[PDB]
Amino acid sequence: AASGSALIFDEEMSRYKLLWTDPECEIEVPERLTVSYEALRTHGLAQRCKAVPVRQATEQEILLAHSEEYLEAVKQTPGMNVEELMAFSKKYNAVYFHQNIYHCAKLAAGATLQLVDSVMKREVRNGMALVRPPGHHSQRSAANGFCVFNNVAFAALYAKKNYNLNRILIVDWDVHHGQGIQYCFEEDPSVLYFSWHRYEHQSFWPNLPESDYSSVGKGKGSGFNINLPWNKVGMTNSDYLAAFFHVLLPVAYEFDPELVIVSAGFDSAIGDPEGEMCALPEIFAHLTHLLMPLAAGKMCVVLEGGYNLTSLGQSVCQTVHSLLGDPTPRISGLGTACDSALESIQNVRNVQSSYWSSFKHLAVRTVVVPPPGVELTLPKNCQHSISESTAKEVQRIRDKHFTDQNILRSLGNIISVLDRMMRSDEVCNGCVVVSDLSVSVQCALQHALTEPAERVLVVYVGDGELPVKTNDGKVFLVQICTKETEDKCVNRLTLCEGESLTAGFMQALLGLILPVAYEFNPALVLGIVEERLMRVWGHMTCLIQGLARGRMLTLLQGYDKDLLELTVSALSGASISPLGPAPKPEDVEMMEKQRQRLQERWGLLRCTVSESW
Numbered sequence: 001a002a003s004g005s006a007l008i009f010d011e012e013m014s015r016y017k018l019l020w021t022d023p024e025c026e027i028e029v030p031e032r033l034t035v036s037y038e039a040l041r042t043h044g045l046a047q048r049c050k051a052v053p054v055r056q057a058t059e060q061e062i063l064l065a066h067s068e069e070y071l072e073a074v075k076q077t078p079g080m081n082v083e084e085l086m087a088f089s090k091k092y093n094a095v096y097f098h099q100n101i102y103h104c105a106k107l108a109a110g111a112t113l114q115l116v117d118s119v120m121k122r123e124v125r126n127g128m129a130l131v132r133p134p135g136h137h138s139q140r141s142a143a144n145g146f147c148v149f150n151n152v153a154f155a156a157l158y159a160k161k162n163y164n165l166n167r168i169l170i171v172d173w174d175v176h177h178g179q180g181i182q183y184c185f186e187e188d189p190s191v192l193y194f195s196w197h198r199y200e201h202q203s204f205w206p207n208l209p210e211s212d213y214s215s216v217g218k219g220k221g222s223g224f225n226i227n228l229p230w231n232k233v234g235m236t237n238s239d240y241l242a243a244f245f246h247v248l249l250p251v252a253y254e255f256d257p258e259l260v261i262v263s264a265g266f267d268s269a270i271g272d273p274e275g276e277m278c279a280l281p282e283i284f285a286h287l288t289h290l291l292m293p294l295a296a297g298k299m300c301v302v303l304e305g306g307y308n309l310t311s312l313g314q315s316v317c318q319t320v321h322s323l324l325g326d327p328t329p330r331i332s333g334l335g336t337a338c339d340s341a342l343e344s345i346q347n348v349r350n351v352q353s354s355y356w357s358s359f360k361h362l363a364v365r366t367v368v369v370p371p372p373g374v375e376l377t378l379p380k381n382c383q384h385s386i387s388e389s390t391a392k393e394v395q396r397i398r399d400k401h402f403t404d405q406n407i408l409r410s411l412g413n414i415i416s417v418l419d420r421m422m423r424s425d426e427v428c429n430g431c432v433v434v435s436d437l438s439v440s441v442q443c444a445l446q447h448a449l450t451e452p453a454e455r456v457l458v459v460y461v462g463d464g465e466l467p468v469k470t471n472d473g474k475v476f477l478v479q480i481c482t483k484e485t486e487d488k489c490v491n492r493l494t495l496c497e498g499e500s501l502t503a504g505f506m507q508a509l510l511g512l513i514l515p516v517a518y519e520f521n522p523a524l525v526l527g528i529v530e531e532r533l534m535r536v537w538g539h540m541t542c543l544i545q546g547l548a549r550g551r552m553l554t555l556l557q558g559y560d561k562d563l564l565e566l567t568v569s570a571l572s573g574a575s576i577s578p579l580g581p582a583p584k585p586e587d588v589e590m591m592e593k594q595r596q597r598l599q600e601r602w603g604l605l606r607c608t609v610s611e612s613w
């Protein structure tokens with residue numbers, strides 16, 4: 001399939017600026033582009049992306065989302081002087097015009113369309129368009145909120161018309177409500193629009209009642225418009241991740257979009273004077289990462305807001321880092337979302353439950369160690385395997401805690417991989433197929449705890465007990481099994497056939513596994529599979545690489561060429577095949593029991609406001 005990422009930017013879109021004193025628009029400056037691109041150049045990301053040039057959007061492409069009258073009015077602007085431009089701007093709300101802004105807006109829409117074409121033609125895996133002006137506020141016959149034409153709506157309609165796409169997800173993480181996109185697709189079930197935005201009970205711009213959680217779409221599009229209003233400032237990484245886990249991601253994976261477009265407005269980042277939130281730029285990596293399993297990785301990230309130049313550059317760098325497959329940074333201090341965020345999440349889940357049943361409630365990169373004598377054609381970012389010091393450690397382990405040379409070799413390979421992952425910055429993750437799970441798991445966990453790894457997240461697909469202690473606060477164990485277990489220790493999550501199985505797992509993956517894992521913040525993920533996992537494991541791997549900077553060691557008991565290939569492909573960063581577009585009632589009941597059991601210790605599991613004694 002496709003590889004690489006597209007970076008679409010041109011200095012020309014920095015050649016328009018506010019020409020008069022306007023305190024409402026003083027923030028939207030050309031430097032936003034400059035700084036941004038220079039950030040990517042300083043850290044070396046811009047050089048690693050395929051540079052697709054910009055083009056003008058044609059008149060018909062513009063008429064896809066706007067009316068002929070408004071297009072003509074804007075076409076008149078390059079011929080106006082300063083007084084005429086100021087009058088024309090006064091005709092609209094929170095926007096300014098400039099002799100070059102029509103040109104730059106055509107260039108922004110055209111760069112968006114170039115990104116869409118690059119992604120859909122399999123020329124690149126994904127990409128980002130550093131554009132100006134933004135788009136998500138502009139409407140069919142109006143410029144609005146620094147926006148002239150709606151770039152993301154253009155991209156959606158263009159993909160629909162030219163690629164016969166049936167399902168497109170739009171994610172608006174700009175701090176403002178992209179009401180232009182909502183208006184454009186409120187009756188359209190083919191374009192699922194999610195937006196989060198500062199609202200403060202309708203007191204924050206654009207002060208619209210239909211920006212609230214009760215706007216779910218009209219007519220055939222009911223349930224395909226999801227507004228999440230922040231009614232307080234200061235929202236943190238925890239609020240954003242809880243929004244993703246308990247609102248956006250389950251709906252997105254049930255929806256199974258054929259293309260993901262992001263209104264990447266970074267005014268939701270800390271330091272921005274307009275959004276006034278407390279999210280670190282690193283969160284925008286994970287956001288990006290959490291969406292990449294969707295649509296086989298086909299993601300189009302388009303710039304919107306973001307006005308603190310420093311945090312803007314940092315957040316753009318984080319987004320591009322994730323788009324290229326670089327290891328995501330560990331997020332610490334995560335916990336429960338604030339009460340206001342929990343109220344907003346609860347309200348949006350309640351109102352959307354009549355459309356998405358998951359919301360209803362009751363009243364080198366990778367190293368591979370195949371079996372001895374087995375040789376596979378591994379992807380281009382992989383390698384195979386032992387030192388004499390490794391053998392000394394193995395002999396010490398054997399003489400102190402445990403005759404087969406193959407199992408001793410497997411333990412030595414485990415130790416070598418762990419050393420190359422933790423102590424060395426050479427390898428990132430690894431997969432070892434092994435016999436004797438007990439000895440292998442014991443050696444792996446104990447050696448990782450001395451790597452050192454302050455915390456280890458073990459994920460075991462199988463039954464029975466494993467040689468791992470969840471007593472202290474250094475190990476957390478997720479076990480997906482077939483038998484029942486009361487699950488007493490607050491440091492363990494037990495999860496117990498049919499067609500609904502896959503639909504359950506993803507649910508339990510998004511609503512339970514990922515929140516606890518993110519709050520736990522492990523230094524290493526240890527995967528174990530003992531022998532329908534083929535359907536889900538891939539996603540499970542990719543998403544779980546959001547933890548521990550991708551440092552994951554998978555242990556596979558028994559040779560299955562399909563399972564080994566899928567594990568290595570997901571660990572190496574290849575795109576994930578979509579699952580396609582309802583869990584069992586007993587399954588969701590058991591999931592809710594687990595959540596109510598664990599949410600007191602792991603606050604990121606909360607999706608309702610806690611009741612006070």
Ligand SMILES: NCCc1ccc(C(=O)CS)cc1
Pocket residue numbers: 024094134137145146174176205265267274304305306
């Ligand atoms: N605050 C009132 C005026 C206003 C309007 C839009 C924005 C954006 O950032 C749009 S992405 C900022 C300010």
Ligand SMILES: [K+]
Pocket residue numbers: 172173174175176177178195196197
């Ligand atoms: K938004």
Ligand SMILES: [K+]
Pocket residue numbers: 185186187188189190191192193217221224225
């Ligand atoms: K919609």
Ligand SMILES: [Zn+2]
Pocket residue numbers: 174175176265267304305306
């Ligand atoms: Zn904005």
